[PDB]
Design a protein around this nucleic acid. Sequence first.
DNA 1: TTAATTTATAAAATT
DNA 2: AAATTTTATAAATTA
Length: 388
Amino acid sequence: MSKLDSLLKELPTRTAHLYRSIWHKYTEWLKTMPDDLKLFLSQKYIVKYIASHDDIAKDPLPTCDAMIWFSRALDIENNDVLVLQQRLYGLVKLLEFDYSNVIAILQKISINLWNPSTDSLQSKHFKTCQDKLKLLLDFQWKFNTNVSFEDRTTVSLKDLQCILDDENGKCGLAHSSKPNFVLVPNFQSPFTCPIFTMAVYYYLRFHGVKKYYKGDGYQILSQLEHIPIIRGKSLDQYPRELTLGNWYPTIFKYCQLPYTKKHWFQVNQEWPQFPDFSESDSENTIGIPDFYIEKMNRTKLQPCPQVHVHLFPTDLPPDIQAVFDLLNSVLVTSLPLLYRVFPTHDIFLDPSLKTPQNIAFLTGTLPLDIESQEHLLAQLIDKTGTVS
DNA sequence: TTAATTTATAAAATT
DNA sequence: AAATTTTATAAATTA
């Protein structure tokens, strides 16, 4: 702006210049989009700019400081500008983070919690595979979305929204409500995938296993107002905090990894987070740029694979159906693998899975070659009847 | 050492 | 009809 130039006299020459140039860059880029003052600065455009440029992406900070300046150095609300600052700093934490460290805690756990026979475990809970899976989903979930526990219990799965876009090749489970997040299937590593986890767990929870464990029935998805992502004693409520708090060290112990409760029960700040915002498109999903989602779920975005087998119901309320079809595709896609690793798993005990066909497809082509998951398997402390 | 936050123990209430 | 989440309560670890 004409009246903008004078406000950089007021700055040290060098950091007035650096800004001048950042600006030229940003608006000379902005000539690249359809579209006269403050509107030019919106989180959307600044974030797009920063992430879309490697040169900038590697060293975002001077840029961010420039932007917070130009912003507050224009007429923009104080609380507002500071929320912008919040988003930017979040973005940098996101870009700079190396998951390569934390990852093996995920791996090391997920596997062991899938393993149907845990001998070294004399601890009371975790008798079934549904207990193991319940915990594992809570863990994989925090790990991927980095969310508060309390908030974890706030989310009603009727709130959840399936994302299926085959135009851009995306699929996942989104929540645009109070906690803001997006989950995506890892087809490269089903075990460390929270959605596959949720699929098995949900089959066990709902269908149940005939003659062993009562399913809850698929009927209650109507009569109930709040369907919790994982159920405690009561159908309609998330398990209590101290309960999980017991379940956790129990597993970390057996896995021999150090345990800090604050990490899993509260937001972890050294860790990346989704922004907050008060149905998708090419570059974003719910409110969120895709690089957030691919980074935090640590998997490339892929279209939902079409399966011809239905383990989940094809008759439901329209709201939940899409969700359950996603679950169906992940489950059915990755099940032959689970069968080749842990054929002793509770899921396989259902007479349904015993049919001549379901046996047919469990024993058919493998979703990926065995030699892929070796390293993963090397991470469990009870070797099964099948050693490879 | 306190505060407060993590765990370990004792009736109890569902499932 | 048994057992383990839940209440509840007290002990104890961390800063």
